[PDB]
Amino acid sequence: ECRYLFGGCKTTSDCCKHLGCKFRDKYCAWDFTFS
């Protein structure tokens, strides 16, 4: 399920688009392109 900003993600492939799961916070933080 696309875990928007601050969405519990088990991995990077568990978040929305512009978001990326970082092995640390457990949530989904922006990550896609230079912005």
Q: List the one residue out of 29, 28, 32, 31 whose CA is nearest residue 9.
A: 28
Burial (CB count within 10 angstroms: exposed 0-12, middle 13-18, buried 19+), residue 32:
exposed
d(CA 5, CA 25) in angstroms, rounded, equals 12
Other CB atoms within 10 A of residue 14 CB: 15
What residues are paired with 28 via a beta bridge?
21
Where residue 25 falls (left for φ over 0; alpha for ψ -120 to 50; beta otherwise) is alpha
Burial (CB count within 10 angstroms: exposed 0-12, middle 13-18, buried 19+), residue 13:
exposed
Task: Please name the method used to determine this structure.
Answer: NMR
3-state secondary structure of 6: coil
Number of domains within the chain: 1
Range of the domain at 18: 1-35
